[PDB]
């Protein structure tokens, strides 16, 4: 009868950069998803393969919460079967996704005067990411025809890049915080339930 730690993920002080999304594991507790859905302050709350209204009546072995920060016009990439810098090089959701994508505009916490360049993303990779794969490799990317020898150069780029989060950007370039709930139902007793 322990209540699952959702404030730990949603009401957290800092979030992870998208290239290194943070996976919190949740198990052995009882969850109320209608509280989250009725916080009513989320600009994105889309559940695939299930409904949040009838969500408290289910039980799963584990619930994974992947949290990170992206920019406004990129929120549309956190969905099954999409393309872009994010979904191809930073955080791919599978097509057969059973979960929820939650997101809210965090322009007040993640924008200092003069910029907030602490949030990063991956701009280069040799191949797309497999669903829920993670990459934090800071190896020099060969974008040209010539070898890079691990040192930057012409057409020899550094694979990570910075977000310019200023309090005056458009919504497309304002920072958004994202939590992706996946529900794993294993061949074991269910440890995450509701009332």
């Amino acid at each position, epitope marked *: 009868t322990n209540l699952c730690p959702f404030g730990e993920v949603f009401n957290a002080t800092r979030f992870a950069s998208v290239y290194a999304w943070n996976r919190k594991r949740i198990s052995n507790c009882v969850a109320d998803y209608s509280v989250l859905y009725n916080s009513a302050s989320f600009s994105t709350f889309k559940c695939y393969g299930v409904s949040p209204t009838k969500l408290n009546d289910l039980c799963f072995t584990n619930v994974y919460a992947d949290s990170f920060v992206i920019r406004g016009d990129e929120v549309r990439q956190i969905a099954p079967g999409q393309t872009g810098k994010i979904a191809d090089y930073n955080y791919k959701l599978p097509d057969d996704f059973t979960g929820c994508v939650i997101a809210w505009n965090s322009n007040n916490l993640d924008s200092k005067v003069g910029g907030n*360049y602490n949030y990063l993303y991956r701009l280069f990779r040799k191949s797309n990411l497999k669903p829920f794969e993670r990459d934090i490799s800071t190896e020099i990317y060969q974008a040209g025809s010539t070898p890079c020898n691990g*040192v*930057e150069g012409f*057409n020899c*780029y*550094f694979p990570l*890049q910075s*977000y*310019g989060f200023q309090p005056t950007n458009g919504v497309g370039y304002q920072p958004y915080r994202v939590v992706v709930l996946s529900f794993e139902l294993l061949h074991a007793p269910a440890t995450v339930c509701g009332p």
Partner: antibody
Framework: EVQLVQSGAEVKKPGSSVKVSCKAS????????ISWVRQAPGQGLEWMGR????????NYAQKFQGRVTITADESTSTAYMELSSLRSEDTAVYYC??????????????????WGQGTLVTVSS | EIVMTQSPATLSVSPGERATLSCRAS??????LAWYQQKPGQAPRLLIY???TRATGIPARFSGSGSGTEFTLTISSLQSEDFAVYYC??????????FGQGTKVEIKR
């Protein structure tokens, strides 16, 4: 805000080495890139190298490859630059500077803000 | 590589007057350009980034403009704290850490 305090002046002999510090009072180096730019007397600026503290990877300009070692310590939030095999041509003021990463450059550095106070290094026989 | 050439070498100007400094890139470097001010015997401080955006705290009398290959910095109502050496830096093409030769702005005596 985030401000950079450097080490004191240094006088060295030809061949000897020198190692300059650069502490950020901003507590966390975070994901900025700390770089070192030297200005010879009466000459322009010359970028030497960078290190990214959160990743531990450094990158050096070709002219300085093999002589410069740029390192960082996150607990004390202090970056260091070690130049060896000094010559008279290495007499200059050495500045450290934070820099965001490229917003699409492909490269690990954009503009430089803020700047260290500067450290004078004089090399004479 | 991408060479930044500045003009003039020196600019003798009396206070209140308008000073216009030029930075020219050998290649097209979009609008990713930075202007730094180095007061005599001081560490540089960044005036302007992205060709036109002024840095936090920079006075209003400084204005950056230009794009592509031609960039200018205008110090409109030239005050006395502004006699210094000004450098430009492109940070799009390789290598993104090249600096301009610099232009000295001294008082006309």
């Amino acid at each position: 805000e985030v401000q950079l305090v450097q080490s004191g002046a240094e006088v060295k002999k030809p061949g000897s080495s020198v190692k300059v510090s650069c502490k950020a009072s901003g507590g966390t180096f975070s994901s900025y890139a700390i770089s070192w730019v030297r200005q010879a007397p009466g000459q322009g600026l010359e970028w030497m190298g960078r290190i990214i503290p959160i990743f531990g990877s450094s990158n050096y300009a070709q002219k300085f490859q093999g002589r410069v070692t740029i390192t960082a310590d996150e607990s004390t939030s202090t970056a260091y630059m070690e130049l060896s095999s000094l010559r008279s041509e290495d007499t200059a003021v050495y500045y450290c500077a934070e820099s965001p990463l490229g917003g699409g450059s492909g490269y690990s550095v954009s503009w430089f803000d803020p700047w260290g106070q500067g450290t004078l290094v004089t090399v004479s026989s | 590589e991408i060479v930044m050439t500045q003009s003039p070498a020196t600019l003798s100007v009396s206070p209140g007057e308008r000073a216009t400094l030029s930075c020219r890139a050998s290649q097209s470097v979009s609008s990713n350009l930075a202007w730094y001010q180095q007061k005599p015997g001081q560490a540089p401080r960044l005036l302007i980034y992205g060709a036109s955006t002024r840095a936090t705290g920079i006075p209003a009398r400084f204005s950056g403009s230009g794009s592509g290959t031609e960039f200018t910095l205008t110090i409109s109502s030239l005050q006395s704290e502004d006699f210094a050496v000004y450098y430009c830096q492109q940070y799009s093409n390789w290598p993104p850490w090249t600096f301009g030769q610099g232009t000295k702005v001294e008082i006309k005596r």
